[PDB]
Amino acid sequence: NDGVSETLLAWRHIDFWTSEHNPDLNATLSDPCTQNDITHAEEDLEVSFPNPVKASFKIHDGQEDLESMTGTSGLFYGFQLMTLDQVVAMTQAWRNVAKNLNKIPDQKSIPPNAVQPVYAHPAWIPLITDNAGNHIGVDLAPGPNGKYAQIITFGRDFDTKFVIAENWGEFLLSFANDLEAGNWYLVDGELVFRDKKSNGPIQDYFEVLKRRTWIKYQL
Amino acid sequence: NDGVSETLLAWRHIDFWTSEHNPDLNATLSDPCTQNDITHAEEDLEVSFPNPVKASFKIHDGQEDLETSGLFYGFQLMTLDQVVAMTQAWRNVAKNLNKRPDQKSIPPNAVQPVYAHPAWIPLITDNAGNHIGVDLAPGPNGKYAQIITFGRDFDTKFVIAENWGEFLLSFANDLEAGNWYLVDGELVFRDKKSNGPIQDYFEVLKRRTWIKYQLERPHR
């Protein structure tokens, strides 16, 4: 099925975990989008959000925290869950880039042929941001060996794109499983990843996702 | 809008024309698909057919063999069953290509530069490995549900229409423009106004696409 279950389940675990270990991060999780907000977005972008993505939006419209000054603390080990407004704005942003480009080194994909080998595509809908040009999001125009609505890395520093999940649900869930596995350090602090079981160092979450993907591919 | 109007309009023109100038070809046009046939197909392939494509199917489920000689100047309009069979056929090819002649697009980056894609749904066949059909996974400068050539001899893919409706309509306009010869007989294309020779319809579509691309390139 679509990964709606996983979405719903993940948000339970994430909502619970944040409330327990990091209230301040909890506060930042926004109220649900209404159905009209999302229909308006879908009309604006002329796309159908996959079911799981619509489910996540109907739980949290990204993160906010206006009274903070140092910037928002990204839920995903520093990366910020985007609001529907930001999703629309950035999607149109990247759509302009694709236009300007119609006339960047070599683009590749892991797995091979899973993601279109391009810098920007109109159908790559960003959902998470580093506020530094890079995104996780959902791919609505997969390559030949890709899957519709797979979750991918793309952006400024992602000449190679990685498929990091089959759907948004699986992604949210693996994030939830990291939290529960104790794979975290608080810097009541900034959230960053470490492999608890291996007494591993602090690592950028993107490098973790890329590594995992690579490993999974070779198997 | 979607190109549903154009679909519906085109089939009126095509149904009319065929009945007048080539009854035998008319006979080959099938009864409509039912909505369940389509839902069953959509489940089988796990895709949503574009609206215009669903409209065409609700007029004719392709052509039905007398042996069927192809409506589109020899190319056969596929039945839903053939669409499903061929889509799975092409889907297996992609799978086997994953375990490893330059593929290009006109316009550049409009169509994925690959031999086979799961989301290229064939609608017309060459009975020789080549297709016109609808692209549900466009390139960066493509458009969802644009109509493309693809297949065995299509190392370069061409976007020949913005939607299925526009395609059916341009076919209809060829017929009404007198751009045909009967070999009643077998239907083949000629440019009436240029007193032109007979031409393969794929070459016509390729030239047309190529010209259109080139006339638009000054604009930005």
State whether A113 and B118 contact (CB < 8 Å).
no
Q: Retrieve residue A53's tokens.
A: 């993505």
Q: How far is CA B20 from CA A49, B13, B14, B17, in A?
A: 47, 11, 10, 5
Read off φ and ψ for residue A21, nearest 5 degrees.
Answer: -95, -15
Q: Provide the CA B120 distance to its chain's centre, in angstroms.
A: 11
Query: To 10 degrees, what angle do helices A35-45 and A84-100 make?
Result: 10
Nearest to A145 among B94, B139, B141 (CB): B94
Chain B residues near residue A141 by CB distance under 8 angstroms: 137-139
Q: Which residues of B touch A113 (CB under 8 A)?
A: 97-98, 114
Backbone angles phi, psi at A171, to 5 degrees: -65, -55
Return d(Cα B66, Cα A64) in angstroms, integer: 66
- Among A83, A85, A91, smallest CA distance to A154 is for A91
Would you say A209 and A164 are in contact if contact means Cβ atoms under 8 Å apart? yes
Quickly list H helices, chain B: 4-21, 23-28, 35-45, 51-57, 80-98, 164-176, 201-216
Question: Comparing C-alpha atoms, which of A150, A130, A140 is closest to residue A86?
Answer: A130
Contact A191, A184 (CB under 8 A): yes
What CA–CA distance (Å, rounded) separates B149 from B132?
Answer: 5
Tokens of A161: 């794109």
The partner residues of A184 in beta bridges, in order of sequence, read A193
Q: What is the resolution of this structure in A?
A: 2.8
Q: A199, A205 in Cβ contact below 8 A?
A: no
Does the beta-carbon distance from B118 to A143 stay under 8 Å? no
**B chain contacts of residue A112, beta-carbon cutoff 8 Å:** 98
Residue whose token pair is 């080139």 = B214
Interatomic CA distance for residues A153 and A128, integer angstroms: 9
- The two structure tokens encoding residue B187: 């239907």
Name which of A24, A7, A12 is nearest A180 in CA terms.
Answer: A12
Report the DSSP pairing between strands B146-151 and B130-135.
Answer: antiparallel
A178: left (phi over 0), alpha (psi -120 to 50) or beta: alpha
CA atoms within 13 A of residue B48's CA, in its CB half-sphere: 8
**Helix, coil or strand: residue A135:** strand
Nearest chain B CA: its distance from A217 CA (Å): 12
> Whole-angstrom Cα distance, residue A37 to residue B112?
32
How close A144 gets to chain B, by Cα (Å)?
Answer: 5
Residue indicated by tokens 């030949």 = A144
Instruction: Assess contact for A171 and A136: CB atoms under 8 A.
Output: yes
HSE-up (13 A, CA, CB side) for residue A212 = 17
Residue B89 DSSP class: H
Closest residue, chain B, to A99 (C-alpha): B141
Q: Check A121 against B137: CB less than 8 A apart.
A: no
Q: A207 near A43, Cβ under 8 Å?
A: no
- Residue of A115, A121, A139, A166 to mutate, interface with B, max B Cβ within 10 Å: A121
Cα–Cα dist B19/B23, whole Å: 5
* Residue B10 burial (10 A CB sphere; 0-12, 13-18, 19+): buried
